[PDB]
Amino acid sequence: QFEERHLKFLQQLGKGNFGSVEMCRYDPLQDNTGEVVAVKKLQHSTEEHLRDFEREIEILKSLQHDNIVKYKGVCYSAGRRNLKLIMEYLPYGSLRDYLQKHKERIDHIKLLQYTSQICKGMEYLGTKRYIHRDLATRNILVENENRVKIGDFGLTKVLPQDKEYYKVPGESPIFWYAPESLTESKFSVASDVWSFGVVLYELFTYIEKSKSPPAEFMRMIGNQSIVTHLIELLKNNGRLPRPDGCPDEIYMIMTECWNNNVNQRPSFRDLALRVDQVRDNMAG
Numbered sequence: 001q002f003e004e005r006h007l008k009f010l011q012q013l014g015k016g017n018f019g020s021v022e023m024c025r026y027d028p029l030q031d032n033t034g035e036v037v038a039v040k041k042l043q044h045s046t047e048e049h050l051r052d053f054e055r056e057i058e059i060l061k062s063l064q065h066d067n068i069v070k071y072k073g074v075c076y077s078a079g080r081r082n083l084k085l086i087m088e089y090l091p092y093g094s095l096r097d098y099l100q101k102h103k104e105r106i107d108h109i110k111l112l113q114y115t116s117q118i119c120k121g122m123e124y125l126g127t128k129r130y131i132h133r134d135l136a137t138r139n140i141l142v143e144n145e146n147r148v149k150i151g152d153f154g155l156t157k158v159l160p161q162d163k164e165y166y167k168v169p170g171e172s173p174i175f176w177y178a179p180e181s182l183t184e185s186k187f188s189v190a191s192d193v194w195s196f197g198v199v200l201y202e203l204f205t206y207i208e209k210s211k212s213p214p215a216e217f218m219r220m221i222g223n224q225s226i227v228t229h230l231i232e233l234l235k236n237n238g239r240l241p242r243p244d245g246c247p248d249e250i251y252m253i254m255t256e257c258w259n260n261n262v263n264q265r266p267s268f269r270d271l272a273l274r275v276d277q278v279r280d281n282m283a284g
């Protein structure tokens with residue numbers, strides 16, 4: 001339990017429509033310093049967003065894995081109605097920024113180390129029947145040069161006991177969404193795997209602006225609405241191209257994640273083995 005008065009503001013870390021993230025020092029003895037944490041609050045405190053936020057917290061609360069970011073607590077000092085979530089602070093930020101600034105020290109082998117760690121996380125989420133729903137390079141955090149961790153779990157949904165998909169706004173990362181998520185609003189491990197396919201695309205393009213999924217899909221779309229154009233482009237087997245210099249065996253994994261049919265997509269266990277193996281062939 002974190003008390004507002006001891007929660008000292010250092011700087012803004014990242015923002016969005018109704019949530020924001022701040023770097024903070026939690027200083028219960030005020031003497032003169034304590035421990036640095038990442039703090040999420042809601043801007044527009046609508047009750048659906050609050051209820052969604054409270055459900056995000058329970059998910060975070062239930063997670064313990066070396067490749068998943070650590071929950072520390074919550075602050076109720078000033079209300080329900082302005083809850084704060086408190087998580088560990090990882091200094092190197094998101095994989096999107098990190099990769100983009102440090103790229104010339106990061107080769108295909110490093111990129112495959114990151115990929116492995118991502119699959120181990122999603123494996124572990126699969127065990128708890130969680131569908132992350134926002135797998136993208138911008139929601140993977142870097143603890144150090146040899147370790148990254150998932151999370152922005154604000155879209156994460158728990159699977160029903162009886163079903164293997166979840167039916168569910170507001171801004172969606174459509175260019176990372178699988179076809180059945182666009183057309184029918186279904187989410188599954190299968191759709192999480194599709195997203196991972198495009199994460200693999202992001203890393204192997206080195207997050208170059210002009211090569212990005214929005215950048216690329218919008219070129220192919222040419223030339224309403226935009227989703228409707230995407231859904232149709234995907235149905236005619238339109239896909240993100242092979243990144244320059246991307247291996248055969250990696251590109252194949254991408255292509256397999258982006259299979260129209262849910263049931264023919266690879267599983268995260270399989271993706272771990274395949275990627276862990278490609279590393280060794282590349283190294284030794």
Ligand SMILES: CCc1cc(O)ccc1-c1ccc2c(-c3nc4ccccc4[nH]3)n[nH]c2c1
Nearest residue numbers: 013038039040087088089090091093151152153
């Ligand atoms: C508290 C919000 C949240 C809520 C979830 O459900 C899951 C993860 C997070 C989260 C998001 C971002 C961070 C960061 C960080 N460190 C940076 C350095 C530089 C630039 C950006 C950074 N973001 N550390 N820990 C973080 C936890």
